[PDB]
Design an enzyme around this catalytic site. Structure first.
Site, short mmCIF file in Angstrom:
data_model
loop_
_atom_site.label_atom_id
_atom_site.label_comp_id
_atom_site.label_asym_id
_atom_site.label_seq_id
_atom_site.Cartn_x
_atom_site.Cartn_y
_atom_site.Cartn_z
N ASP A 231 -29.89 -14.69 72.30
CA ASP A 231 -28.89 -13.89 72.96
C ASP A 231 -29.40 -12.52 73.45
OD1 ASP A 231 -25.85 -13.43 73.38
OD2 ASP A 231 -26.35 -11.74 72.08
N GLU A 261 -31.66 -16.01 76.97
CA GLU A 261 -30.63 -15.55 77.87
C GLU A 261 -31.12 -14.21 78.46
OE1 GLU A 261 -27.38 -13.21 76.61
OE2 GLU A 261 -26.06 -13.92 78.11
#
Ligand SMILES: OC[C@H]1O[C@H](O[C@H]2[C@H](O)[C@@H](O)[C@@H](O[C@H]3[C@H](O)[C@@H](O)[C@@H](O)O[C@@H]3CO)O[C@@H]2CO)[C@H](O)[C@@H](O)[C@@H]1O
Ligand SMILES: [Ca+2]
Ligand SMILES: [Ca+2]
Ligand SMILES: [Ca+2]
Ligand SMILES: [Ca+2]
Ligand code: NA
Length: 483
Positions: A231, A261
């Site tokens: 993340d 990400e």
């Protein structure tokens, strides 16, 4: 076999504590449709029971300690998650864990810290003189005690925060202390984008780096994970993310597939991240998401010949994870940019039947989103499954592209001799329907091929040269395979 990743959650999955049971009950079905890996949401305790996992409180609490008024996380208890992973694994489906390392939320108490404010558009600029605030940085883990790790957190383990409890004001505060500074390298948007929200972890602190490596090894071993989803990668020191992944692979001896990400609609910047991480991990193809969305929203005026322009998948095919929509781009969310429903099956054909990239199917697209708007994504599983069957059983062999018209574009897969009856011809159009002559291989001459999506009922016969004339309806997709 072609691998296919499934994101197993959407923003509005219910806070009923049964998501791990749902996964356990869906394992056979996912294995039967061709899913080879599942991305599960953050499994550790959040600032509250209902947090999705992106405001993590304690990475060592997988739902077994009484903390924040609850034992379970939003998704269920630790033993329920272990049983779900067990059912996936006995059906040869891999599990990737979501990893949220940028910040920590929900501290047990405030501490006094000397801080300065910075310019939100240029975090390298300090805009105030130093002064004292009360920040939420004291993390004690009262329900866990020292189980698994005796590390406690304090202000000096963070670079900054966004709330002073003293004055009750919200600003971007950079802390003052020994060698305190925003980490680098990170995204250079806003001058330095280390800071995002909550208490920002200081990846310059040696104890923080060692603890986080140890936690990573523990997490992979405690749940027997096969990989990771990182993340908020553009907000975390890149060299640290490179080293962390390597340490987990060194200790487990496992491949540990990892996708990061890196949210930016710019291929050059994504390429900079791949180079700075020594190509040891893939990235989500953000630019391709935006091209697909653009096409779905221009009512036929998009030039379909340009779908690949500026995408990561055209430059680094082996390091791209392709996707149509996710929990951030779904309706009502922060990065809302949904692919219109009429084009969604065309976008799934594009990522699932082409030879490059590692394609992800969104839970929200298969089953429907349960948000409160009037434009929720409807359940499209009956339209996607046929395309997933095309990927699982026919998308093999040499590929030929036909990006030669502003509306109707297609591609073919010759098939592979080791996958009986493999091979296919796909056509999509953002406008009126029509035809295209395409080559599928001389070895398929004479065969009767049909549209597995059922959009067209007329079969096509491959000529003696290995060419066929394929058709596609307006604003639709057709995927021909051996009858
Ligand atoms: O359990 C299913 C399947 O798992 C294993 O395959 C995984 C790979 O090891 C892993 O590398 C990943 O593959 C992707 C590439 O890394 C990527 O560069 C690009 O080429 O796409 C690949 C996916 O098609 O994922 C697969 C699982 O999806 C194992 O090796 C298999 O034998 C096993 O059947
Ligand atoms: Ca720092
Ligand atoms: Ca950060
Ligand atoms: Ca067009
Ligand atoms: Ca054939
Ligand atoms: Na930091």
């Amino acid at each position: 076999v072609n691998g296919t990743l499934m994101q197993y959650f959407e923003w509005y999955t219910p806070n009923d504590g049964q998501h791990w049971k749902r996964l356990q009950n869906d394992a056979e079905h996912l294995s039967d449709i061709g899913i080879t890996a599942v991305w599960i949401p953050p499994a550790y305790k959040g600032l509250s029971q209902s947090d999705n996992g992106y405001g993590p409180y304690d990475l060592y609490d997988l739902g077994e300690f009484q903390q924040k008024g609850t034992v379970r996380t939003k998704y269920g208890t630790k033993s329920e998650l272990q049983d779900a992973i067990g059912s996936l694994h006995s059906r040869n489906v891999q599990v990737y864990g979501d990893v949220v390392l940028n910040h920590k939320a929900g501290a047990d108490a405030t501490e006094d810290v000397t801080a300065v404010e910075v310019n939100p558009a240029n975090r390298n600029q300090e805009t105030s003189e130093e002064y004292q605030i009360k920040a939420w940085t004291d993390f004690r883990f009262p329900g866990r005690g020292n189980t698994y790790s005796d590390f406690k957190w304090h202000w000096y383990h963070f670079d900054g925060a966004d709330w002073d409890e003293s004055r009750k004001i919200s600003r971007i505060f950079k802390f003052r202390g020994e060698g305190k500074a925003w980490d680098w390298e990170v995204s250079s948007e806003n001058g330095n984008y280390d800071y995002l929200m909550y208490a920002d972890v200081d990846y310059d602190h040696p104890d923080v780096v060692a603890e986080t490596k140890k936690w990573g090894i523990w997490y992979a071993n405690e749940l027997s994970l096969d990989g990771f989803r990182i993340d908020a990668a553009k907000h975390i020191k890149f060299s640290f993310l490179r080293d962390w992944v390597q340490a987990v692979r060194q200790a487990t001896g496992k491949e540990m597939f990892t996708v990061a990400e890196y949210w930016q609609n710019n291929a050059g910047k994504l390429e900079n991240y791949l180079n700075k991480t020594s190509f040891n991990q893939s990235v989500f193809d953000v630019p391709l998401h935006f091209n697909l969305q653009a096409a779905s929203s221009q009512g036929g005026g998009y030039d379909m010949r340009k779908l690949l322009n500026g995408t990561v998948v055209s430059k680094h095919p082996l390091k791209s994870v392709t996707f149509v929509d996710n929990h951030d781009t779904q309706p009502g969310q922060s990065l809302e940019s949904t692919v219109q429903t009429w084009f969604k099956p065309l976008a799934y054909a594009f990522i699932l039947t082409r030879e490059s990239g590692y394609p992800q199917v969104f839970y929200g697209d298969m089953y429907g989103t349960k948000g409160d708007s009037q434009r929720e994504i409807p359940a499209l599983k009956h339209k996607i499954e046929p395309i997933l069957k095309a990927r699982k059983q026919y998308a093999y062999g040499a590929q030929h592209d036909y990006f030669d018209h502003h509306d109707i574009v297609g591609w073919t897969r010759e098939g592979d001799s080791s996958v009986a009856n493999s091979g296919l011809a796909a056509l999509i159009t953002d406008g009126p329907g029509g035809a295209k002559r395409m080559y599928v291989g001389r070895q398929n001459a004479g065969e009767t091929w049909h549209d597995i999506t059922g959009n067209r009922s007329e079969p096509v016969v491959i000529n003696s040269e290995g060419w066929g004339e394929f058709h596609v309806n307006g604003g639709s997709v057709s995927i021909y395979v051996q009858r």
